[PDB]
Amino acid sequence: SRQAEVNIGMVGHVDHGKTTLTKALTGVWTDSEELRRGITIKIGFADAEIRRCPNCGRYSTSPVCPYCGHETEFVRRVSFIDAPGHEALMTTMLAGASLMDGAILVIAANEPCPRPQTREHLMALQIIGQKNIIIAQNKIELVDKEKALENYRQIKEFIEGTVAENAPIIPISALHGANIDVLVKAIEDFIPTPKRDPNKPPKMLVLRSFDVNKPGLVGGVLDGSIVQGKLKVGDEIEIRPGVPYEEHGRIKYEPITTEIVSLQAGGQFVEEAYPGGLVGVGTKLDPYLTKGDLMAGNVVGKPGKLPPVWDSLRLEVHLLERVVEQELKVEPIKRKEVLLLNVGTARTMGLVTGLGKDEIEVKLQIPVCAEPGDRVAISRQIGSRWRLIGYGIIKE
Numbered sequence: 001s002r003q004a005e006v007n008i009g010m011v012g013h014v015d016h017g018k019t020t021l022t023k024a025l026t027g028v029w030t031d032s033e034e035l036r037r038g039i040t041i042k043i044g045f046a047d048a049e050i051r052r053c054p055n056c057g058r059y060s061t062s063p064v065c066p067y068c069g070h071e072t073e074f075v076r077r078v079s080f081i082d083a084p085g086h087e088a089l090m091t092t093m094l095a096g097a098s099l100m101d102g103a104i105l106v107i108a109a110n111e112p113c114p115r116p117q118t119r120e121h122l123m124a125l126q127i128i129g130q131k132n133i134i135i136a137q138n139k140i141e142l143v144d145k146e147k148a149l150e151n152y153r154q155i156k157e158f159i160e161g162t163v164a165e166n167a168p169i170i171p172i173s174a175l176h177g178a179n180i181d182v183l184v185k186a187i188e189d190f191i192p193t194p195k196r197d198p199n200k201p202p203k204m205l206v207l208r209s210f211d212v213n214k215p216g217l218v219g220g221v222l223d224g225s226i227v228q229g230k231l232k233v234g235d236e237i238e239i240r241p242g243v244p245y246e247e248h249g250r251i252k253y254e255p256i257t258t259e260i261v262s263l264q265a266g267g268q269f270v271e272e273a274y275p276g277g278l279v280g281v282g283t284k285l286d287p288y289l290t291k292g293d294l295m296a297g298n299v300v301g302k303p304g305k306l307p308p309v310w311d312s313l314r315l316e317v318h319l320l321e322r323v324v325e326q327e328l329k330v331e332p333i334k335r336k337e338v339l340l341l342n343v344g345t346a347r348t349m350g351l352v353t354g355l356g357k358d359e360i361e362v363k364l365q366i367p368v369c370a371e372p373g374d375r376v377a378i379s380r381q382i383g384s385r386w387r388l389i390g391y392g393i394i395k396e
């Protein structure tokens with residue numbers, strides 16, 4: 001198919017223009033769509049078709065060239081991940097780096113550099129090793145030539161030594177759509193579709209689950225991101241942790257098997273789906289089991305080829321600096337503390353039952369399906385709001 005091939009994360013300090021840039025690239029000026037956004041992770045996908053004008057040779061995301069008017073040729077479909085707040089974004093990168101193939105760091109030319117949030121976003125990208133970065137120097141029309149060049153130097157200084165050191169800095173105006181063609185061109189040159197092994201065991205992280213049968217039948221539907229291999233109609237799949245049940249007054253989870261009846265990607269039904277963008281998986285599952293996002297956070301794969309399920313985790317801990325109302329200093333993790341953990345699209349509270357050298361043991365409220373070595377975002381309830389304090393690496 002012509003489904004999205006890569007997911008591009010939109011990062012940068014609040015108000016610098018991430019959302020406006022996303023809309024400028026996706027062509028959305030109306031409308032909501034936030035009804036397909038994640039619940040465990042407030043993540044949203046917005047596709048755009050990258051095309052090139054045979055005539056003037058400039059890139060754009062319209063079937064009609066904005067510069068000469070001619071019809072453009074299809075090059076590749078991509079998906080942009082844009083989230084509401086700083087926290088949700090940071091958590092998304094640390095919990096699911098496998099969801100991003102590259103990133104566009106938005107930096108507003110009229111703001112003093114660098115800002116706390118921008119610093120934390122780069123830190124997250126540094127931690128997950130995401131180096132396919134493009135920098136968008138936004139709101140360029142709001143500063144004179146001198147300010148503009150000076151801001152550029154600060155950015156170059158700012159990115160030196162980081163995973164963004166080799167990133168191009170592109171002066172643009174997201175709001176007025178200025179110099180956007182250069183940015184689209186950069187997406188093609190700096191965020192190439194990775195060479196994935198379509199033969200690795202399939203793995204999909206479930207974002208949302210529904211019962212699409214109108215009020216007043218088709219099986220349950222799972223919406224998510226394929227991070228490995230591929231899915232095909234007719235495929236038999238296993239879902240973990242699975243369906244919850246009660247045994248001796250306690251909750252347990254039963255992995256469940258089903259079959260793929262349909263696949264929606266890129267805005268249409270297909271026979272095979274791959275990594276990139278959101279994928280809708282129609283199954284033979286009883287809608288009663290997927291209704292109301294009951295399977296959000298679960299992992300999909302082929303029977304006998306899924307990561308293990310954990311009731312508790314031994315985590316190698318790496319606490320964050322954190323510079324973004326005072327309370328910057330992250331206090332050490334104490335036994336008995338209740339933390340909020342995000343791993344992949346799964347989310348669960350955890351009770352610290354043991355402490356070790358740069359390590360904690362945590363009993364989970366809800367089991368999670370993950371592989372040893374996977375990254376887990378750790379949040380602490382500060383007053384009355386969960387705050388990201390670091391991440392852990394699952395150990396055996």
Ligand SMILES: Nc1nc2c(ncn2[C@@H]2O[C@H](COP(=O)(O)OP(=O)(O)O)[C@@H](O)[C@H]2O)c(=O)[nH]1
Pocket residue numbers: 012013014015016017018019020021106138139140142172173174175176
């Ligand atoms: N003048 C100007 N304003 C812009 C530009 N891009 C975005 N904005 C505005 O600045 C504000 C913050 O933008 P928003 O897209 O919500 O960015 P976000 O907070 O990073 O996700 C909005 O009022 C936008 O209309 C630009 O190129 N020029």
Ligand SMILES: [Mg+2]
Pocket residue numbers: 018019020083084
């Ligand atoms: Mg925004």
Ligand SMILES: [Zn+2]
Pocket residue numbers: 053054055056057058065066067068069070
């Ligand atoms: Zn053209």
